[PDB]
Design a protein around this nucleic acid. Structure first.
Lengths: 226, 214
DNA sequence: TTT
């Protein structure tokens, strides 16, 4: 199966620089054009840049909004795509997707389209500094009990930039987890996450939230307690 | 540049419905019009290319039509897994441009929220802050009101509410409500409740704790 | 990425 794994996203100041990478596998990288496509928060998709194959002399093309600031490039030996982003602006804030172009146009048509997409890497252009999250456990106080289920949670407060990931028991519990989108309050983000389990298996059995904020190199675990 | 317009930015449909999403280009694009699906989690895949060609592995319920400037994506017999935002894209001339997207919600039967309330952690209390949290989970429709009652009085200042995207398996929503106070403010009241008002009940769903029993 |  085709895989396109983006890396390199993070916080950068206006006018600064950042290089994105994409590791491709599962197809013959050197025969395809490659693209970057982006998506500003809560907005739509925007094509950023294209680089053609070696057979087409690595011809490059850019959207007007990024021309002369961004450079797309590739290393066919390592099946890698790159985007060097310079003189960054607030409105470059977006999720950036590595995208493989459609194949042979004799079969697939001349018109451009985007056949495979990565999961994206998030780029935040902002004057504000990295701030790691305070993590607090959300446990039911001593009180009434609904026999069937218990719902526990973790509050993730006052961080910048996005994003965080919360996992419950090292990803073993997935069904009953809800992830609440982060909201920006006074320059800092807050989000929460809940998990719901059979009330037999807790507190008897253990439940832990693990909170990663890669931008601040932080991982924090809260074991949840009565 | 060629402007792509999806005049409908959102709609709601039931399972089994025909959904039609349209796309207008500012100039003739010679049928080089493609459609993508973006799941709530951000995952993008191509559905249709060259107006009507179905991508290998994509279900046949997706079809495309059109010519000139006017195109449509049709989803026949809508399925649960089709909750997503749909985008058109012209590939006739650079820069290649996308429509603004059409977000599709899928209807289900009304469902009342399961409510849970949480007192501030000792950890936070030590730091000089007090956040009380209410979860309203697995409800439909999306519209819901949460009120915070401190010793019986409504509190709105310091409240932040976050809804989940629609749940891909059962079409429900969840919401979190967080009230943040200074620890000094927290300590000077005892009863903390969040009340959920929703179309599924004539009276609110209520959860509460008392500070000096926690 | 036909010639």
């Amino acid at each position: 199966e085709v895989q396109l794994v983006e890396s390199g996203g993070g916080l950068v100041q206006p006018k600064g620089s950042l290089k994105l990478s994409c590791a491709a596998s599962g197809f013959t990288f050197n025969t395809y054009a490659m693209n970057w496509v982006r998506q500003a928060p809560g907005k739509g998709l925007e094509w950023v840049a294209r680089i053609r194959s070696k057979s087409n002399n690595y011809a490059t093309y850019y959207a007007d909004s990024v021309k002369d600031r961004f450079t797309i490039s590739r290393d066919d030996s390592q099946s890698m795509l790159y985007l060097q982003m310079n003189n960054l602006k607030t409105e470059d804030t977006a999720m950036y997707y590595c995208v493989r172009h459609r194949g042979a146009p004799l079969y697939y048509g001349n018109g451009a389209w985007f056949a495979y997409w990565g999961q994206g890497t998030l780029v935040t252009v902002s004057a504000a500094k990295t701030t790691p999250p305070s993590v607090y456990p959300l446990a039911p106080g001593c009180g009434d009990t609904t026999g069937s289920s218990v719902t526990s949670g973790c509050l993730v407060k006052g961080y910048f930039p996005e994003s965080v990931t919360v996992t419950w028991n090292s990803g073993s519990l997935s069904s009953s987890v809800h992830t609440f989108p982060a909201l920006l309050q006074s320059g800092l983000y807050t989000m929460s996450s809940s998990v719901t389990v059979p009330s037999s298996t807790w507190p008897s059995e253990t439940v832990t939230c693990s909170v990663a904020h890669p931008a601040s190199s932080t991982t924090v675990d809260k074991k949840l307690e009565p | 540049d060629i402007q792509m317009t999806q005049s409908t930015s959102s709609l709601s449909a039931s399972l089994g419905d025909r959904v039609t999403i349209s796309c207008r280009a500012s100039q003739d694009i010679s049928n080089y019009l493609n459609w993508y699906q973006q799941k709530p989690d951000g995952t993008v895949k191509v559905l249709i290319y060259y107006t009507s060609r179905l991508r290998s592995g994509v279900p046949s319920r997706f079809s495309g039509s059109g010519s000139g400037t006017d195109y449509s994506l049709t989803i026949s017999n809508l399925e649960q897994e089709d909750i997503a935002t749909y985008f058109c894209q012209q590939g006739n001339t650079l820069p290649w441009t996308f429509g603004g997207g059409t977000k599709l919600e899928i209807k289900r039967a009304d469902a009342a929220p399961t409510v849970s309330i949480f007192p501030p952690s000792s950890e936070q209390l030590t730091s000089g802050g007090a956040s009380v949290v209410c979860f309203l989970n697995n409800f439909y429709p999306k519209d819901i009101n949460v009120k915070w009652k401190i010793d019986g009085s409504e509190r709105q200042n310091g409240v932040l509410n976050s809804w989940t995207d629609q749940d891909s398996k059962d079409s429900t929503y969840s919401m979190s409500s967080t009230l943040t106070l200074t620890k000094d403010e927290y300590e000077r009241h005892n009863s903390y409740t969040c009340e959920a008002t929703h179309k599924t009940s004539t009276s609110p769903i209520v959860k509460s704790f008392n500070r000096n029993e926690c």
